[PDB]
Every structure is written in structure tokens, then in C-alpha cells.
Amino acid sequence: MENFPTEYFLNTTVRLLEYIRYRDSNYTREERIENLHYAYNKAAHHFAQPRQQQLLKVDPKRLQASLQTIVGMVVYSWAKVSKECMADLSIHYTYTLVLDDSKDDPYPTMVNYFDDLQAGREQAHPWWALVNEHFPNVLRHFGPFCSLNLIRSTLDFFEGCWIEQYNFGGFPGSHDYPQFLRRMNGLGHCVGASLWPKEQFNERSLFLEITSAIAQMENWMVWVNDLMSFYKEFDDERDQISLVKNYVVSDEISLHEALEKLTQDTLHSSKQMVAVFSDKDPQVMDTIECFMHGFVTWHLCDRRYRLSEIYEKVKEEKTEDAQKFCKFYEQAANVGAVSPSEWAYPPVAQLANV
């Protein structure tokens, strides 16, 4: 199909939003902007420090854009946490997105990973040096259990990026590969566990609800990111691997059948997320609900996903799905579409030369 499944894509997206009850929040634009600027400002000063500028090899423009996309993701989906927590998570998730830009083989820098770690010597891989040095700022907002989940998920992520340098979709017939990889690079347990600051949640008292949230949120969060990204990756000949593309290669099926699997898995996860938490601790279901809505709003408003294009193509159309979609899209824009000039300034590079 040299043609993007617009009708199909519209149907699945709409059903998703209905399933989760995509709606309005008491999260006002003024509030969004206060948080966006706050998280961005702290993170920008952090990455402009000389040490960060030195060990972190990233093109300034790509770093600028990666940060802006992460602050938006965190401020929008982690609506219930403090400003400091939004800012610290913003730094952490920016480090993870940036590692994706590296092509350097980790092998030589991991030869002594364990012994250095055990001995307390700075890690040879500069990414780990920066990330572990900064980790305490993130972990101070959480209890021991949630902290362990963040630490594990970030280690899994490092391995995920190592594996991806091989641009490997999986051996035909290796059915377990696709999801094995998506979970490795998903940060599912990092996200899931980072939603529960010890400041407003008691880890020990809500252990079972948190653990369940982590387990269920892992798959929802990544599957939704895959679905929403399916448009920008469709004609991207540079990106050769993804959950859907690997389904195609590893399971030996069509892109349509791979998209079908993703869409069914995504809806089943949404339906079950609601069915499980719609009657547990209120604050928990609130964080969970704000995350699902925020996450979707972020995908719809960030130009990285180019969803404005699909909107603009079915803007004036009589079909049911199209209208439902546009209304949703329009909703998101009302609270989500904010000019970067209102919060993302000054540029990281500017603060860097100072």
C-alpha cells in the first residue's frame, strides 16, 4: 500500500479516544505554560553547563528540539506531579531520547561496566557518566520500589539502543523478537513508576495498584506511541525498524496485518486499563487518566508526529470517523497548541556560550 490507511487509521484512533474517554481537564493554558517554561528553563540551564556540553555529543539544534519535545511530553502527561518533578523527569527523558542519536558502538565502553559500577568509578561511556551523576535528582522524588523500576528501565533502554544500532527487524520466524525489543527500548517501567511521587503517594500502601499500573501502562504507553507514530514512519525510508515493521519481518505478515495486531492490542489495553482502575483509589485513577489524555494530546500537538497533516486532509469531510477525529484534534489544539516562544527560551546554545 503506497497509500496511508487514512480511513482505517481514522477509525482506530477515534475508537482509542472513545475507549479512554479523551476529554477536557482542569489543566488550563496558563498552567500549561507556567509548567512548560519552568521545566524547560531548569533543563535548559542543566544542558548548557560545560560538563554536559562536553560529554553529551549531540547537534545543538537536535538537542534543542529533543528537549522541547520532552518537556511537552512530561508537562502534558505528568499533570499531577510538582514542577520540580516535571523538570527533573524532563532532563532524564531528554538524556534517553538523545542516546538514540548515537551510532558509537557501546562494546568497548561496556567491557568494564560492572567492575567500575561496583567500585564506584565513573563509567567509561560518557552517557552513563552524565545520566548516573544526574539520576539522584530524579530518584529523590520517589520511594525505593519506584526508584528500582526507573533504574532497571533505564538500563533496559541502554541495551535497547545497543541492539538497534544493528537495524535488525528480527529473523523471519522469530515471533518473540518484536515485542521483546519494544519493551527493551520502551521505558515502560520508567514512565509507569515515575507517575507516583512519594510526596503524594504511599508506595507501600498502594503497592498493588502501582505494580498493576506499571504492568498495564507499559504496554498502553508504547502501543499508543507506535499507533500515533505510524503516520510519520509510513514513508520514512530512514527508519527501517519499529514494532509494526518488525512484526512484518519477524512474523512474515503484511503491513496491514501488522497494523491490525497493533490496533487490536492497543484497544484491548485501553479497555482493560479503564475496567481495572475506574474503581480504585481516586488519586491513582486521576494520575492514570491524566496521563492517558495528556500523552494523546501531546502526540496530537507535537509537530514531530505531523498529525496536523491528516487533520488538514479530512478537515471538511462528511464521514463519521473524520468528523469525530477533527473534533478530537480540535479539542487537543485548544489546550495543547502553544507557541514555543511562550515558554521555550532562551535557546540552550545561548545559555551555553554565556
Provide the binding-site residues for its own copies, judged by CB under 8 A.
106-107, 110-111, 113-115, 117-121, 132-133, 135-136, 139, 143-145, 147-149, 151-152, 155-156, 158-159, 162-163, 166, 168, 170-177, 180-181, 204, 207-208, 211-212, 214-216, 218-219, 268-269, 272, 275-276, 280
Q: Which does 239 bind (CB under 5 to 8 A by kind): its own copies, Mg ion, none?
A: Mg ion
Q: Which does 4 bind (CB under 5 to 8 A by kind): its own copies, Mg ion, none?
A: none
Q: Which does 268 bind (CB under 5 to 8 A by kind): its own copies, Mg ion, none?
A: its own copies
Task: Determine whether the annotation assigns residue 334 to a binding site.
Answer: no
Under the rule (CB under 5 A), what is the footprint of Mg ion? Answer: 100, 164, 239, 241-242
Q: How far is the CB of 31 from its own copies (least distance, A)?
A: 32
| Contacts (Cβ under 8 Å, ≥6 apart) of 20 | 270, 273, 274, 289, 292, 293, 296
Q: Closest CB to its own copies among 286 and 342?
A: 286
Are 217 and 189 a contacting pair, CB within 8 Å?
no
Q: Closest CB to its own copies among 72 and 143?
A: 143
Active-site residues, by number, are 93, 96-97, 100, 182, 232, 304-305
Q: Closest CB to its own copies among 44 and 131?
A: 131
Q: How far is CA 58 from CA 47, 52, 54, in A?
A: 11, 10, 10
Task: Determine whether the annotation assigns residue 11 to a binding site.
Answer: no
Task: Determine whether the annotation assigns residue 101 to a binding site.
Answer: no
Q: How far is the CB of 243 from its own copies (least distance, A)?
A: 14
Q: How far apart are CA 62 and CA 67, in angstroms?
A: 8
Task: Determine whether the annotation assigns residue 239 to a binding site.
Answer: yes
Q: Which does 282 bind (CB under 5 to 8 A by kind): its own copies, Mg ion, none?
A: none
Q: Closest CB to its own copies among 71 and 214?
A: 214
Task: Determine whether the annotation assigns residue 164 to a binding site.
Answer: yes
Task: Determine whether the annotation assigns residue 229 to a binding site.
Answer: yes
Burial state string for 265-294 with b = 16 or more CB within 10 A and e = fewer than 16: bbbebbeebbeebeeeeeebbebbbbbbbb
Q: How far is the CB of 219 from its own copies (least distance, A)?
A: 5
Q: How far is the CB of 183 from its own copies (least distance, A)?
A: 8
Q: How far is the CB of 85 from Mg ion (least distance, A)?
A: 26
| Helical axes 83-99 vs 126-139, angle rounded to 10° | 160
Q: Closest CB to its own copies among 207 and 345?
A: 207
Q: How far is the CB of 96 from its own copies (least distance, A)?
A: 16
Task: Determine whether the annotation assigns residue 210 to a binding site.
Answer: no
- Binding-site residues, please? 100, 164, 225, 229, 233, 239, 241
- Binding-site residues for Mg(2+), please? 100, 164, 225, 229, 233, 239, 241
